Structures are given as structure tokens and as C-alpha cells.
């Protein structure tokens, strides 16, 4: 039960954008320019990590 509960929380924890406009890498680069898009993902990898 503990192992299963922890595993799901590790999958549901892909939700929060972590203080950015978007909460999905796929759309971060599509609608932003690295100069201003990279700082957005700065809190995404920093969040998932």
C-alpha cells in the first residue's frame, strides 16, 4: 500500500506548472522563445527534479 501510494504521487506530481505560464514542456518551447522560454522551464525541471 505504501509503495503503490508513493508511486502514484510521483505521477500525479506532474501537475503544478511551478510558477510559470504553462505546466507542460511540450508547449513551453512551442509558444515561447528560449531567451524568455528557458527561464520558464527553469522552474519545470527544477520542479520535477
Amino acid at each position: 500500500n505504501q509503495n503503490a501510494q508513493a508511486l502514484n504521487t510521483l505521477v500525479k506530481q506532474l501537475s503544478s506548472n511551478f510558477g510559470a505560464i504553462s505546466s507542460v514542456l511540450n508547449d513551453i518551447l512551442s509558444r515561447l522563445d528560449p531567451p524568455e522560454a528557458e527561464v520558464q522551464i527553469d522552474r519545470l525541471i527544477t520542479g520535477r527534479l
Binding site: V24, L25, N26, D27, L29, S30, R31
Partner: protein, 50 residues
Amino acid sequence: YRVVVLSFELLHAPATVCGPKKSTNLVKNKCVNFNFNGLTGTGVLTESNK
């Protein structure tokens, strides 16, 4: 100086407008990034029966 202030949609979903964009063959289950009317996604796309 005409200072008439206008305002379009502010972060709303697609509507009766369609920008000048082309079309291409869709992706069924390919594990690649996709584009369908702006929205972009990656990973693996799997078909369910919902």
C-alpha cells in the same frame, strides 16, 4: 490621436476564428511531439475506449 482601446480574447480556447495555417497527416499512436491547433505535446499517445 485616436486612443480607442480594443481588446481581443485573453487566454481563451479556439473559437470561430482560424488563423492562416496549413494541415498535415495526423498521428495515431506515434511517440512524438504533436501539433493540433497550437497545442503541443510529447511522450506516447495511446488510444482508449472512453
